[PDB]
Amino acid sequence: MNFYSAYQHGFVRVAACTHHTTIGDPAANAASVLDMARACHDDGAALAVFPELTLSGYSIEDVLLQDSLLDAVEDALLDLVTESADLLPVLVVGAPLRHRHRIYNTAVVIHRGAVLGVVPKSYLPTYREFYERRQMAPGDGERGTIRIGGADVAFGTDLLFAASDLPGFVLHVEIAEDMFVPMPPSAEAALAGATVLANLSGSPITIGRAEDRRLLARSASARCLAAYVYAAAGEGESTTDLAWDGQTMIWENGALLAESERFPKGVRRSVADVDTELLRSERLRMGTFDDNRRHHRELTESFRRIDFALDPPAGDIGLLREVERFPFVPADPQRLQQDC
Amino acid sequence: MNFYSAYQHGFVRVAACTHHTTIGDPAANAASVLDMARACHDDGAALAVFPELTLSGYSIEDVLLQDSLLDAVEDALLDLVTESADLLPVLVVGAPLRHRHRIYNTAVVIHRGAVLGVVPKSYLPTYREFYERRQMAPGDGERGTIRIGGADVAFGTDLLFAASDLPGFVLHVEIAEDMFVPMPPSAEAALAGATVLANLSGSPITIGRAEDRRLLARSASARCLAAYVYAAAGEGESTTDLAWDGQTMIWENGALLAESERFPKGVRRSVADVDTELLRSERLRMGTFDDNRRHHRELTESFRRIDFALDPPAGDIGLLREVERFPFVPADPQRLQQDCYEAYNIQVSGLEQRLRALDYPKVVIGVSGGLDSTHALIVATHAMDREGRPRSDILAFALPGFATGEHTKNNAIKLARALGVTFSEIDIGDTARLMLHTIGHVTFENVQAGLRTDYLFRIANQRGGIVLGTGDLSELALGWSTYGVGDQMSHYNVNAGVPKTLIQHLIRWVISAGEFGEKVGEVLQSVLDTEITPELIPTGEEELQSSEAKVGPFALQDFSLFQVLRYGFRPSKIAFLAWHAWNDAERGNWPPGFPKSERPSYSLAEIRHWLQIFVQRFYSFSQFKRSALPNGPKVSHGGALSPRGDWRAPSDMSARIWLDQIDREVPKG
Amino acid sequence: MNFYSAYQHGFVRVAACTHHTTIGDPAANAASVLDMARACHDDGAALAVFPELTLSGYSIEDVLLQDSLLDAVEDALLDLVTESADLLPVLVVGAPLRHRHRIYNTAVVIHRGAVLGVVPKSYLPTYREFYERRQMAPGDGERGTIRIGGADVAFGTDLLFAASDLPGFVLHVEIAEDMFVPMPPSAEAALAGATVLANLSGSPITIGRAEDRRLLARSASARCLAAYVYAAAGEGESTTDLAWDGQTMIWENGALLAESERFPKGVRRSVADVDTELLRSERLRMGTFDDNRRHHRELTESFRRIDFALDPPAGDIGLLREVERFPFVPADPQRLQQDC
Numbered sequence A, C: 001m002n003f004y005s006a007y008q009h010g011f012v013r014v015a016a017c018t019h020h021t022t023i024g025d026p027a028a029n030a031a032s033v034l035d036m037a038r039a040c041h042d043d044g045a046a047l048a049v050f051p052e053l054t055l056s057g058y059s060i061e062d063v064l065l066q067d068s069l070l071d072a073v074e075d076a077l078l079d080l081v082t083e084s085a086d087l088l089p090v091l092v093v094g095a096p097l098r099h100r101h102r103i104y105n106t107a108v109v110i111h112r113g114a115v116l117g118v119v120p121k122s123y124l125p126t127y128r129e130f131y132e133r134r135q136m137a138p139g140d141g142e143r144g145t146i147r148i149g150g151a152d153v154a155f156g157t158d159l160l161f162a163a164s165d166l167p168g169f170v171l172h173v174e175i176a177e178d179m180f181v182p183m184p185p186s187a188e189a190a191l192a193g194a195t196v197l198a199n200l201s202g203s204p205i206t207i208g209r210a211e212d213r214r215l216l217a218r219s220a221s222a223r224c225l226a227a228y229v230y231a232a233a234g235e236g237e238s239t240t241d242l243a244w245d246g247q248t249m250i251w252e253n254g255a256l257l258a259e260s261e262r263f264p265k266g267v268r269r270s271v272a273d274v275d276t277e278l279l280r281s282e283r284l285r286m287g288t289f290d291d292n293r294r295h296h297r298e299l300t301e302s303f304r305r306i307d308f309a310l311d312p313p314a315g316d317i318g319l320l321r322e323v324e325r326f327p328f329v330p331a332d333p334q335r336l337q338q339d340c
Numbered sequence B: 001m002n003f004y005s006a007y008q009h010g011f012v013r014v015a016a017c018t019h020h021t022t023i024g025d026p027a028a029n030a031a032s033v034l035d036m037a038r039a040c041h042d043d044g045a046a047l048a049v050f051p052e053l054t055l056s057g058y059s060i061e062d063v064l065l066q067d068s069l070l071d072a073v074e075d076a077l078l079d080l081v082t083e084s085a086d087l088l089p090v091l092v093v094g095a096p097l098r099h100r101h102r103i104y105n106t107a108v109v110i111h112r113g114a115v116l117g118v119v120p121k122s123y124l125p126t127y128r129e130f131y132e133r134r135q136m137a138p139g140d141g142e143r144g145t146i147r148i149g150g151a152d153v154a155f156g157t158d159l160l161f162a163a164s165d166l167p168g169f170v171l172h173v174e175i176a177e178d179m180f181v182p183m184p185p186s187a188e189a190a191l192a193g194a195t196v197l198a199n200l201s202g203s204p205i206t207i208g209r210a211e212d213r214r215l216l217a218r219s220a221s222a223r224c225l226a227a228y229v230y231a232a233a234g235e236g237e238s239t240t241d242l243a244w245d246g247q248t249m250i251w252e253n254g255a256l257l258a259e260s261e262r263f264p265k266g267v268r269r270s271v272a273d274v275d276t277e278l279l280r281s282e283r284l285r286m287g288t289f290d291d292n293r294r295h296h297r298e299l300t301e302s303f304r305r306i307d308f309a310l311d312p313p314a315g316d317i318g319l320l321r322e323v324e325r326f327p328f329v330p331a332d333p334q335r336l337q338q339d340c341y342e343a344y345n346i347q348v349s350g351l352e353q354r355l356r357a358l359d360y361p362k363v364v365i366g367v368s369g370g371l372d373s374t375h376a377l378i379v380a381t382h383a384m385d386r387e388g389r390p391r392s393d394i395l396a397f398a399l400p401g402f403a404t405g406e407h408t409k410n411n412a413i414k415l416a417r418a419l420g421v422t423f424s425e426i427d428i429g430d431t432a433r434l435m436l437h438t439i440g441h442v443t444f445e446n447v448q449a450g451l452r453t454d455y456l457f458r459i460a461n462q463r464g465g466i467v468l469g470t471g472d473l474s475e476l477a478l479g480w481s482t483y484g485v486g487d488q489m490s491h492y493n494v495n496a497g498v499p500k501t502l503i504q505h506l507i508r509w510v511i512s513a514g515e516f517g518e519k520v521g522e523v524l525q526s527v528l529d530t531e532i533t534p535e536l537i538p539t540g541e542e543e544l545q546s547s548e549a550k551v552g553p554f555a556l557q558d559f560s561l562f563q564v565l566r567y568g569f570r571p572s573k574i575a576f577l578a579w580h581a582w583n584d585a586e587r588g589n590w591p592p593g594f595p596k597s598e599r600p601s602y603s604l605a606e607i608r609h610w611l612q613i614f615v616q617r618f619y620s621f622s623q624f625k626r627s628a629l630p631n632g633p634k635v636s637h638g639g640a641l642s643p644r645g646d647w648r649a650p651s652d653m654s655a656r657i658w659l660d661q662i663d664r665e666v667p668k669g
């Protein structure tokens, strides 16, 4: 084996991307997404998560209901897919999509020129600064397929994207408010076998909301013994009534793997190497995890596995991870004081 | 109603106890438990939670399978039950109980001489330092009844213990490892209507396990929008292979209400007052909570409600809760710095975007030298900076009409000239003097305000810019504006999100950060000192203190505003909260930057008076001014007052019921 | 028998009331409602329907979320119930009520000093001029009980209020948006045995909305072979962004029995005599009606019957109904032209 290949030791490179929203301009959002994704490709990442409703902008309210906007989103999405034929990572791109009667707040999971699936937001907030049920429809319980670019692809809150050559890498996709409810789609999905939990979030920034973002993302990564990839909306979202900080972060089992500048000027990424084997092991030893899955067997066998072959770079790409010299002696002095 | 009864204001007193374990002596554990329970009784608490396997000791391994031990456990449990007849709170005591084939790791829910229920542990950990499936049986899916002292009582992971006279108090009980799995029993129960989530925990202490306890407990309280009561095992558990820290804590909606000394010598309690109304309200407003419950309807209707009449003490028993004086301004210096950073950045960034949209116009602002205009100017400057735009596109304007001359206009000129903006002065007096005469002349102050805004708009038309307003959230709340043609109107209001109690500390933050000049800093501190100090002899009757004279002190009105906007609390509840926060200046904390000469103490009389003014001006008068409100970014978590955002309300509505409630419930003094 | 008693010939007198909303003042709404109900009592009515969110005002938006308002609503509701002990008609009063987590948009069905039931609105509109899912929760699928004034009363979209002494009088209650969806609760209810269909409506008035109100109400009364009672909100509702005409109307099997002045100055009623026997007979002969009920047997047996004794006046109280001299020859000249 190539001893210096991070992937061949169980690692998987993941990126949480915040892009340049151009509210109402889907082609201009897809341009920014394509550029950041090509960067992720150069970095050798396998996964790249963008913010909620990437292709249209989260803040555009009833402009979501205009046929020209929806059509431009579909065209930009098909453009993205076709460009993804030369891209290593799995792209997770937000979009307002047309299904049956309404438009759903979806994440399109795109890979190697194809749409693996389309996940709808499950819990649409309609309170305080949020008015989401006006324009969009909940997906909780929506299964089946959706037709996107002359193809029937998987659609629903019950998906898992398992890498056929990386048995540790199983991706699940929720959206914003999803992880804030007492029983988030991601927890069920984790019991069902999900190891990397992605979250696209629009998230207008507010005093203390970054603290909540971190609390819940970290606790999810801890409880679900998984990696959590978070990406929020940044510069470009309509400042009619809200502001946007563009926070991105990558958690692993309660441990902050990476995060980006808040309130940036320009796009940002958080790229890290997730040790899938560490999760595999924490789960092999914590029987009560499997015990919990079994207690909810019906909820957890109803997930659909979408198989894809990632084929990662097999050479030296470093290790974007802080391996401490002293596993028993933390190098941060305040933590070492508490430990002692 | 008794105004001073924490219970009659929706509070419930709860206890998380760590006791003196005496491994293998159920009588000695029942003794420690009865003593601590009698303490909680004297404190007026309604709930007291003890650690895992209380009556036997969590660490006694295969001694759990000895019949003499189990029998002594049953005897001590029956003793405890009988004694609980004269005990106010609901006791939640751990014990290994006999059911069908095996012994289950149970929490016995005891109250007023009867066993309300028996909740088994759901996920027995068998890994690393834990060997629980050896001695005991999982309870996930066990329903039915269990026979305890000649009575068939509910048994299962599906119970709820709801107070028939305290509807906000609905108890669910899980045990240790239960809260550590992807789908804890407590989440389901919360959806099913649980408001107080109890955890009995043995929890051998280890490097960083208190961190995990805190992480998951706080996360539970936040996600489940509930109170979380945690109690771990302490002195007396066999240190054959483990150590025990006896941590107890009480969380509420992600916020630590109380915790006790780790590794104590002797028993400990954490006693706090949980605001059930706060939970009730958070759940009233987060539709997605009920959305989630409905999505899991089968799981959430399968719960069994066991009804009990608590009958709590109706007198004054104080309030074991730290109510901060400034809901918008945290008294912790680290948190206040973080808050101020975030607020300042969202203001700057929202203006940055508005400007990029309009191909970078000029920025017209009338600067009077008060706090709101000063801060708006600073923000506009920083926005123009980060977008790489000449500061001379900022057009400050002092428009005086009837002021003879004052230090504040000098503040304005000095700050503007130190920043390097484009400053000009324009005396509106003549236009007002003409205008007044034309309409055949209170009215003249209205005319001046109108003319300031008119002139700024026409100058923005002339030089191709946008008027940037300076109205803050407190002025919007109370209607301290001139609507229409007046200081209310602008093209983009950067200060709309920010309350007036936070503007001062935003300016202090800008000073201490010192990103601008030292000269800018000095003039800003001048602005602060000038405006926050009352004028010896009133300077012409216009400054911040004038608004305070008409609408009450903002320290009190921002408190009322936070309560109303976030929780919809009734007036009497606001008066109770503010009276506990403010009536004693020596008690509680103060934020940084308050010289001890500016630390007041308000009376019930004053709180009641300004609350009358507040409900009258917020529910009724001022709404029509917010209804047509320029753009601007929401700042605090407490909400904003945009009609397109956090406050949808009618313009033609009376405040009669709120005034009537203040009259019926809040004492005159 | 007393030959001149309309009740003894199968009739039942029903009223659709629009009252004087006093937005934010529940006690004053209860005052207006009590006065109109007392009128309905004098008129010998068995049923009196008031508009959506009667006790609080429909248009008060986030003021529904203030604890003082909800508490005054509870107090006024209990006063109403106690006063209804001396009132003949069944009162159907709108109100925002507290249950489990949220407040539901409910109609309290009150009779002779007790609450027979509490029906929640089923479909909360969140589009155009409507923002209801913000403040209130859907009732579709909510069963069980609700606690109101120290009593557990039936709660849900599955109630029926059957008069034990007037078997032709079986009441069902839906609310506004309920009757505009492809499958309205009232249709199930009618198959289930409901003969008088009540609808509480707030209904901000608009060019052409009264036409739609009539279209759907009349179409309901015809398809369901039942009587339809409609009552909309009038003077007092916040004109911040909407206007209110206070239309009330009573339909029976496609035929307008009564209606009231639009945009009135002052409260209004529509009082009419419903020929329950005409409904009984149309249903006896239309086999396909019962056939439709059988095809939906599970949906239709799940309704709960709350029985109550109306005890109507047995004397001469006139007949509030236009009996045409020539059933074969309509007296309206235009209709007679069409008929010929």
Ligand SMILES: Nc1ncnc2c1ncn2[C@@H]1O[C@H](COS(=O)(=O)NC(=O)c2cccnc2)[C@@H](O)[C@H]1O
Residues within 6 Å of the ligand: B365, B366, B367, B368, B370, B372, B373, B397, B398, B399, B400, B401, B449, B452, B470, B471, B480, B481, B482, B487, B542
């Ligand atoms: N001399 C000045 N030069 C330049 N700009 C000035 C000057 N005076 C005011 N402004 C401007 O009006 C904004 C706030 O007005 S105020 O003074 O706090 N209160 C009122 O107008 C008021 C209060 C109650 C009812 N109606 C009106 C300030 O931010 C500033 O932009």
Ligand SMILES: Nc1ncnc2c1ncn2[C@@H]1O[C@H](COS(=O)(=O)NC(=O)c2cccnc2)[C@@H](O)[C@H]1O
Residues within 6 Å of the ligand: B446, B481, B482, B483, B484, B486, B621, B624, B625, B651, B652
């Ligand atoms: N609900 C409404 N909807 C629409 N228009 C309304 C409404 N209520 C009043 N008005 C009118 O608008 C003017 C507002 O005056 S103001 O410049 O904002 N200042 C003051 O009212 C003021 C008064 C007393 C003490 N301090 C300040 C009012 O005089 C009135 O004519």
Ligand SMILES: NC(=O)CC[C@H](N)C(=O)O
Residues within 6 Å of the ligand: A176, A177, A180, A201, A202, A203, A204, A209, A212, A213
């Ligand atoms: N990230 C989000 O979706 C923000 C909304 C959420 N209720 C919160 O306050 O954190």
Ligand SMILES: NC(=O)CC[C@H](N)C(=O)O
Residues within 6 Å of the ligand: A211, A212, A214, A215, A216, A218, B211, B214, B215, B218
């Ligand atoms: N209670 C905790 O330890 C929470 C820590 C978490 N990382 C946060 O910032 O919220």
Ligand SMILES: NC(=O)CC[C@H](N)C(=O)O
Residues within 6 Å of the ligand: C125, C130, C175, C176, C177, C178, C180, C201, C202, C203, C204, C209
């Ligand atoms: N208030 C409502 O629920 C909406 C009623 C309105 N008449 C409509 O047709 O939608």
Ligand SMILES: [Cl-]
Residues within 6 Å of the ligand: B366, B453, B456, B467, B468, B469, B470, B486, B487, B488, B489, B490
């Ligand atoms: Cl202005």
